[PDB]
A paper describes a structure:
Ricin contains an active A subunit ([name]) and a B subunit (RTB), which promotes retrograde transport into the endoplasmic reticulum (ER). We showed that [name] is recruited to the SRL by binding first to a conserved sequence at the C-terminal domain (CTD) of ribosomal P-stalk proteins.
Here we evaluated the second-generation lead compounds that bind at the P-stalk binding site of [name] and identified RU-NT-192, which had 30-fold improved affinity relative to CC10501 and inhibited the cytotoxicity of ricin holotoxin in mammalian cells with no apparent cellular toxicity by itself for the first time. RU-NT-192 had a 32-fold improved Ki value relative to CC10501, while RU-NT-206 showed a 53-fold improved Ki relative to CC10501. The [name]-RU-NT-202, [name]-RU-NT-165, and [name]-RU-NT-192 structures were all determined at 1.8 Å. After superimposing these structures and the structure of [name] with RU-NT-206 (38), the RMSD values range from 0.23 to 0.46 Å, demonstrating no significant conformational changes in the [name] backbone upon binding of these inhibitors. Moreover, the ethyl groups at the 2-position within the benzene rings from RU-NT-165 and RU-NT-192 formed distinct hydrophobic interactions with Leu207. RU-NT-192 improved the EC50 by 10-fold at 125 μM and by 200-fold at 250 μM and had an EC50 value of 200 pM at 250 μM.
Author numbering: 1 to 34, 37 to 40, 42 to 257
């Protein structure tokens, strides 16, 4: 088939720098937001044409293996990926999204849909580790790309695959959603170190939907009820209005 053509952003771990990773994340944001409350809001899923529903992230590593992740522009989340002659999809939430993803990678000979969604709860269970024990950085991403690639010929076990999804979703989707998490990956690249995310990152990730709702329903930025977030040391604090989150959250779900 001659599939529908979605925008494609490239990143390689070979020779990766703070700047090249920053350019990558900035490019992903720019193609995701094609509407600003106080912070850009991702396009409404309602009435969004199929030709504008997806973007593609092509990842390459030092071994010159390439995989292509497919991102939903309405929530910045990975719905599936292509490696060579195979395409793999998380289980869709509803019939409409199931139809939308039939338009991705349609020239691939083998299409596979998992029974599990791309959510952290199930991915962590499959990986056998929580996010707080899965290291992130250029090293983990290099390994994630290879693990994703070799799943198509059975060279990757499912826990490794699920761990590699958790790495990719955070270093791409969450970093695009939050300048704070983009900064977290920047720092790992600066020290050439790999480390798991701390509670401030993990709780920010868990709070994206609630933070988005609180901001968009706020009275001139003021929240109706406070949102609890975590500090780096695990202690909690309350967020009462959108202003403190401006340097933190870069994209909001509609
Ligand atoms: C400006 C600080 C801030 C604003 C909005 C949300 C959060 C939570 C991710 C944070 C913090 C980041 C680390 C903090 C700490 O370790 O004290 S607070």
């Amino acid at each position: 088939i001659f599939p529908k053509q979605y925008p494609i952003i490239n990143f390689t771990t070979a020779g990766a720098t703070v700047q090249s990773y920053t350019n990558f994340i900035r490019a992903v944001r720019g193609r995701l937001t094609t509407d600003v409350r106080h912070i850009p809001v991702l396009p409404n899923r309602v009435g969004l044409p199929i030709n504008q529903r997806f973007i593609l992230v092509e990842l390459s590593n030092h071994a010159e293996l390439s995989v292509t992740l497919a991102l939903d522009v309405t929530n910045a989340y990975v719905v599936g990926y292509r490696a060579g002659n195979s395409a793999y999809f998380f289980h869709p939430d509803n019939q409409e999204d199931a139809e939308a993803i039939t338009h991705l990678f349609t020239d691939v000979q083998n299409r596979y849909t998992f029974a599990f969604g791309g959510n952290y709860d199930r991915l962590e269970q499959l990986a056998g580790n929580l996010r707080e024990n899965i290291e992130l950085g250029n090293g983990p991403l290099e390994e994630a790309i290879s693990a994703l690639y070799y799943y198509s010929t059975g060279g990757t076990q499912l826990p490794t695959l699920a761990r590699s999804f958790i790495i990719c979703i955070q270093m791409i989707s969450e970093a695009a959603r939050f300048q704070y998490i983009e900064g977290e990956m920047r720092t790992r690249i600066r020290y050439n170190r790999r480390s798991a995310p701390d509670p401030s990152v993990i709780t920010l990730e868990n709070s994206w939907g609630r933070l988005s709702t609180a901001i968009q329903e706020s009275n001139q930025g003021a929240f109706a009820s406070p949102i609890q977030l975590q500090r780096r040391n695990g202690s909690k604090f309350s967020v009462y209005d959108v202003s403190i989150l401006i340097p933190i959250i870069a994209l909001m779900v509609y």
